[PDB]
Design a protein around this ligand. Structure first.
Ligand SMILES: [Cl-]
Length: 91
C-alpha cells in the first residue's frame, strides 16, 4: 500500500566528482519526478519514511540504468522524498 506523490521539480545537486557533476546535468530528466511513499501516519521517524520512499521509488522506476545512475538517484530521490514528507507534514 504505497501511494505515489504528485510531480515535483527534480533538484539540482552538485557532486564532488567533475564527471558526476556533469553526468547529473545531462541525465537528470531520465530520473523520477514523482516519489512512492507509505503514508506519514505509519511513521514516527522521517528517516524511515525517506528510506522506504527511496527504496520503493527507485525499484518501481527500474521494474536502462548504470551504477552511476543509482548513486545519482540515491542522493537526489532522497531529497525528493524529504520534500514529499514536507508536503505530508504541512497537511
Ligand atoms: Cl535513505
Amino acid at each position: 500500500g504505497y501511494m505515489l506523490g504528485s510531480a515535483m521539480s527534480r533538484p539540482i545537486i552538485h557532486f564532488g566528482s567533475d564527471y558526476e557533476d556533469r553526468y547529473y546535468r545531462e541525465n537528470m530528466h531520465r530520473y523520477p519526478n514523482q516519489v512512492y511513499y507509505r503514508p506519514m501516519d505509519e511513521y514516527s521517524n522521517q528517516n524511515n519514511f525517506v528510506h522506504d520512499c527511496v527504496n520503493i521509488t527507485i525499484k518501481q522506476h527500474t521494474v536502462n540504468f548504470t551504477e552511476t545512475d543509482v548513486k545519482m538517484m540515491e542522493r537526489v530521490v532522497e531529497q525528493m522524498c524529504i520534500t514529499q514528507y514536507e508536503r505530508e507534514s504541512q497537511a
